[PDB]
Curated annotation (Swiss-Prot), chain A:
Keywords: Activator, Aminotransferase, DNA-binding, Pyridoxal phosphate, Repressor, Transcription, Transcription regulation, Transferase. GO terms for biological process: biosynthetic process. The gene is gabR. Coiled coil: none annotated. It comes from the Bacteria. Disulfide bonds: none annotated. GO terms for molecular function: DNA binding; DNA-binding transcription factor activity; pyridoxal phosphate binding; transaminase activity. This is HTH-type transcriptional regulatory protein GabR. The modification N6-(pyridoxal phosphate)lysine is found at residue 205. It comes from Bacillus subtilis (strain 168).
Length: 363, 365
């Protein structure tokens, strides 16, 4: 009975789960003799090669498959990365941003500066002033604000990293697969002429988060630091990797993304239109030109926690922007701001969801 | 025409891949609408409940699913543990042992003591001497010497840990689904009255056709430490989790374990008979009646490296004890003690494998 405006979930109904299992039988019969065993620690080479081709095609990312590392989550690869990067590196994160990564870095004993955003995303002025060593950025659709970083700002960050040795940018290209605006913008890593960027990718938005498949691409110098480790074991089963590779090479991935691009586009249009009507125009929407969510701000007498406590009662799954407040202070000011995810939201349940949303906002 | 005496986990020839895939289907059907969600960070709860019920009756492990953390393999679970334990904790490991885990700890910048064995396992003598803060131990079937630590030694370790704060015992239970003849002695943590043991288990032996599924059971203090972080995400795919749960609860698992046990019971018997037949009083089989490996000591004038070198020339794959040293600096190998691993040993390969081993142990015949 719940309706879900979650940005963390997907509808199982639009994922071709039967194709996936069919690829799995194919991968299994292809590599039956050795499915049993562990893969190369970075992941199967042929599989790393398929991905390499994919992200070069879609994101213009330039690399050799040996630079790629596959892992069971962005957060296992982020941890590893903190061990490849200089021990005394000062990290910098978007504010607001991904609270888990913030917590991960702190718990690793790192200093994390918090960089505020402007209309173009991560503030280059703040970056220069604070002087961190490594930036963590989400250029395709800033998490959670949704700002698509323009190539002008991408170049600004790439010039910053070039100006001094041992500066790195971690490019978190999370939900970069769908675009409802001018066409794609090549990843920072592709615009880079000096190998200062670590490109991170995941299959959680395109596939299903249940499937724990992610990867990252290392500059050569960090790759040699990884290989010098010797003890690392792969975290994705051999069959999972081969199933993904089969899913992609068969073209099913390409079909799935193209179908979904259209599906999300139209569902996003519907949902917004229904927000503007039900709220009479008295709602502010931001970060809606890409990705699987946007941000909505309301004029109401209620606090964010009131709306959230109430929306929970109306059986509406929804999250407050306060969830993404990195630098702490008792400072909720202005309009309550909520993130509106729509991957998990049914076509049929848009009108009801907006009405439930209205009631939770106003009473 | 290679023959391998080097495997300690099965392969796809041994695994009912079809049963697994069919359980995966059913699990997926049952839990369709929830695949679009990411798991609970400790793993799906009802999965944790299933494993817990299982391990309580097979190993005598006493715990609640609330204390269990599921992960994509033992490495990732060990990595996390080092972050839950005191930063400046000193670790200690058995020698001979799992070198990979030695490097993991060393790369994490930890002090690691190396602790020799006697005929009851990890040396309490050496432990009370070298004074570490946390022990890493394989009490059910030592890796790779095969020693089953007796309860008297388990109690000594337990008492040791209880004596000062910030002392813990990691218990690596890795192949305890296979016990031959006499029933097993339960897991060490079944004796753990003061919450000093962290139980680490895996499905790598009893199953692994590549599956990355392990789990660890935490004492409340470390569990609270874990819940304090708030940033951890499950690494084991939700599909793998539900499948295994179905595999277990459908009964398919015990049926598999029952079959494999007899199969490995046969092979160990048939292999030891053959060793005793071609060698006689010249072979000593040291090791327990458990697991997928044992230790052979040879009464020969060849050195370990000689035998290993003649072994590769006869296309027989084996390892001597010296491989399982954790550390090395200015010394080398030893004298005829090899470990035999028979998880992937064809029955047809037994006599020929034993005949090559005989050749390599003298260089004649
Ligand atoms: C900022 C950011 N980057 C990457 C990911 C993908 O993570 P996995 O590869 O799936 O482990 C995510 C995923 N996050 C959803 C959680 C959002 C929340 O509100 O907690 C992410 O956010
Ligand atoms: C196989 C094994 C493990 C478990 O490793 P996984 O990460 O579960 O594959 C742990 N300890 C020892 C000694 C082993 O041989």
């Amino acid at each position: 009975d719940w309706i879900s405006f979650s940005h963390m979930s997907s509808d199982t109904d639009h994922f071709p789960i039967k194709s996936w299992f069919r690829c799995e039988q194919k991968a299994a019969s292809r590599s039956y003799r050795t499915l049993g065993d562990m893969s190369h620690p970075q992941g199967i080479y042929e599989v790393r090669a398929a991905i390499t081709r994919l992200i070069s095609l879609t994101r213009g990312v330039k690399c050799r498959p040996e630079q790629m590392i596959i892992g069971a989550g962005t957060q296992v690869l982020m941890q590893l990365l903190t061990e490849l990067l200089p021990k005394e590196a000062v990290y910098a994160m978007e504010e607001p941003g991904y609270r888990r990564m913030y917590q991960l870095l702190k718990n690793a004993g790192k200093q994390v500066k918090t960089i505020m955003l402007d209309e173009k995303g991560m503030s280059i002025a703040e970056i220069t002033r604070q002087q961190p060593d490594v930036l963590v950025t989400t250029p395709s659709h800033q998490f959670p604000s949704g700002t698509i970083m323009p190539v002008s700002r991408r170049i600004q960050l790439l010039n910053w990293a070039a100006e001094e040795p041992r500066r790195y940018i971690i490019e978190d290209d999370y939900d970069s697969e769908f675009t409802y605006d001018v066409d794609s913008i090549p990843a920072l890593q592709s615009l880079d002429r000096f190998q200062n960027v670590i490109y991170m990718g995941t299959f959680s938005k395109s596939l299903l988060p249940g499937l724990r498949i992610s990867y990252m691409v290392l500059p050569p110098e960090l790759l040699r630091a990884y290989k010098q480790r010797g003890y690392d074991l792969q975290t994705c089963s051999s069959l999972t990797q081969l199933t993904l590779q089969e899913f992609i090479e068969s073209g099913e991935y390409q079909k799935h993304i193209k179908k979904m691009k259209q599906h999300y586009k139209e569902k996003r249009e519907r949902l917004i239109t229904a927000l503007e009507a039900e709220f009479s125009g008295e709602v502010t929407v931001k970060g809606a030109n890409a990705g699987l969510h946007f941000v909505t701000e309301f004029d109401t007498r209620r606090t964010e926690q009131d709306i959230l406590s109430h929306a929970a009662g109306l059986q509406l799954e929804i999250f407050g922007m306060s969830r993404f407040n990195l630098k702490e202070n008792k400072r909720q000011t202005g309009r309550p701001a909520l993130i509106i995810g729509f991957a998990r939201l049914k076509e049929e349940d848009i009108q009801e969801g907006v009405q439930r949303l209205f009631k939770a906002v106003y009473g």
